[PDB]
Amino acid sequence: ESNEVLFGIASHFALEGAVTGIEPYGDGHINTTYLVTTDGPRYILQQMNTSIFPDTVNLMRNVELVTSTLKAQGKETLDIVPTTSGATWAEIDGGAWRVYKFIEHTVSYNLVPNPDVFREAGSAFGDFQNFLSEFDASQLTETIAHFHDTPHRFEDFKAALAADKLGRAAACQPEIDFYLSHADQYAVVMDGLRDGSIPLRVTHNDTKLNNILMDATTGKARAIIDLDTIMPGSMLFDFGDSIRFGASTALEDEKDLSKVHFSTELFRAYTEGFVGELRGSITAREAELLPFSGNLLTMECGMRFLADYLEGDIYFATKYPEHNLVRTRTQIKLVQEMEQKASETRAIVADIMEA
Numbered sequence: 001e002s003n004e005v006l007f008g009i010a011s012h013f014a015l016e017g018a019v020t021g022i023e024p025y026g027d028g029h030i031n032t033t034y035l036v037t038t039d040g041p042r043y044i045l046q047q048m049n050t051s052i053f054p055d056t057v058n059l060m061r062n063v064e065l066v067t068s069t070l071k072a073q074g075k076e077t078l079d080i081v082p083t084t085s086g087a088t089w090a091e092i093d094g095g096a097w098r099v100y101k102f103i104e105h106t107v108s109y110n111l112v113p114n115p116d117v118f119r120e121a122g123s124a125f126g127d128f129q130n131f132l133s134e135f136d137a138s139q140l141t142e143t144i145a146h147f148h149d150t151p152h153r154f155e156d157f158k159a160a161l162a163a164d165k166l167g168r169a170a171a172c173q174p175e176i177d178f179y180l181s182h183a184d185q186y187a188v189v190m191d192g193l194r195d196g197s198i199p200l201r202v203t204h205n206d207t208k209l210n211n212i213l214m215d216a217t218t219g220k221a222r223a224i225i226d227l228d229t230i231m232p233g234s235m236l237f238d239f240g241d242s243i244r245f246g247a248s249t250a251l252e253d254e255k256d257l258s259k260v261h262f263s264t265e266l267f268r269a270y271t272e273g274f275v276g277e278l279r280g281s282i283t284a285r286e287a288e289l290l291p292f293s294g295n296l297l298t299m300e301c302g303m304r305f306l307a308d309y310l311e312g313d314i315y316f317a318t319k320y321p322e323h324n325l326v327r328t329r330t331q332i333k334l335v336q337e338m339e340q341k342a343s344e345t346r347a348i349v350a351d352i353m354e355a
């Protein structure tokens, strides 16, 4: 938005400095995020995407519950800065806005630079699952329905494909046919949740690497951010999504596919950290599905990118017309390598489950 509008928004919130600037910030695809600079502290200002999260009240209730519980254990988290009237968010001119304190002395990554960073990510998200187990499912109502229900995502994909609103399907038949041909694989986790062979757990549901902040000195995890999708699911959604984003040798939107590979060493590092924290709760069936959960979440995210391309880019932020096609192509390349390396990942999990 204009500066006039953004500075106006900021005046609704209990900031503790005179604002000097408000500038676009970060690589989130969903909300619209800004860095607020002041004569003292920094803030993150976000316009929440109400097309994706229509029930703002329930969403903020969940975020308040999670963050207040962390605070009450003396654990660093996202610190909501209230409105000047004490509310957790503001509805202003038809938009929903919130502010968080900027988390100082941190670093974050869109791409794993070395195995230790990714091991730490695994530990952080594994620990967060232990934390979340303290809630029962009823305390944290779903903020998005069918969120990691891959068969439901596939129904959405098939509809986007049949409609082919922009005539973009002609240019991406290999990608389309990849997702169509893997239809038989999409129900495995949902079927296990439904029949009780996979435990229903409270999960984070968007565990990509850039949703953790690490300390700039110690390298240890400081805080997990992007708390909007905390809701019931499977452990496998958090593990699989982490592998999807972080076991790649390339960015999610890397144009040069020759740079995109699935790294079994990174898979190992993350699994060491994650299982390291969850060894006392992980079931045999969950352990059996750890490698395939990577395939599943990567395919789910990929099909969502491609569906969005076919629909004219209505869901994910994009920077250029082909951006979602570029994104779906990395996800496909990753799954192709995950398939080829299946025996190796199976062996890695077995080896860690004996440690």
Ligand SMILES: CC(=O)N[C@@H]1[C@@H](O)[C@H](O)[C@@H](CO)O[C@@H]1O
Binding pocket: 029, 030, 052, 205, 206, 208, 229, 241, 252, 301
């Ligand atoms: C709420 C929502 O749709 N979040 C998505 C997440 O599911 C997806 O895996 C990611 C891809 O980078 O983008 C967004 O964060």
Ligand code: NA
Binding pocket: 146, 152, 156
């Ligand atoms: Na739906």
